[PDB]
Amino acid sequence: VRKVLMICLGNICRSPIAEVVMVDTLEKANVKDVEVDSAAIGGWHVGNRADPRAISTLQKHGLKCTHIVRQIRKQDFSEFDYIFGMDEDNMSELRRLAPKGSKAELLMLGDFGLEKKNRIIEDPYYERGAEGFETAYQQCVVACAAFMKERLQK
Numbered sequence: 740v741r742k743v744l745m746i747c748l749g750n751i752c753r754s755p756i757a758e759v760v761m762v763d764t765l766e767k768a769n770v771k772d773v774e775v776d777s778a779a780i781g782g783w784h785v786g787n788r789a790d791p792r793a794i795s796t797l798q799k800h801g802l803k804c805t806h807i808v809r810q811i812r813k814q815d816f817s818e819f820d821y822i823f824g825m826d827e828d829n830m831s832e833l834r835r836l837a838p839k840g841s842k843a844e845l846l847m848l849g850d851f852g853l854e855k856k857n858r859i860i861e862d863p864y865y866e867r868g869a870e871g872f873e874t875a876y877q878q879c880v881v882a883c884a885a886f887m888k889e890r891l892q893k
Contacts, residue, residue: 741773744819750779753825755789760879778811792869816841823848825860852885
């Protein structure tokens, strides 16, 4: 099995969408030997569910989110083949957390598929509405497909 882990700062807005979109993306491609999970850098929301705006955004697109927030752990860097951050702050945090020489490949999700200017998946939490969740969703749809096609399907 190949294992993919989506990471964002709190695991209530961005990475649960990326996790759900990746699973949906694998399903449409009939790729069955890839497991997907998500987790948080920080611990504020551990035990909670995704942001209501993330849940509603996925529903809008016929997807469901039943994920429970957990925090990343060091053994993640030995269990997962691919660990994805959403933005450059994510990448810095993952770099400092990864045990040197651990097997996980650290990638930023938007380096796949998107144009350069659209590669950062921005934290939507502090906006009023859910527009920032929809754009994260659109980005994940493009990025996840491209990653799957290049790296997972060769």
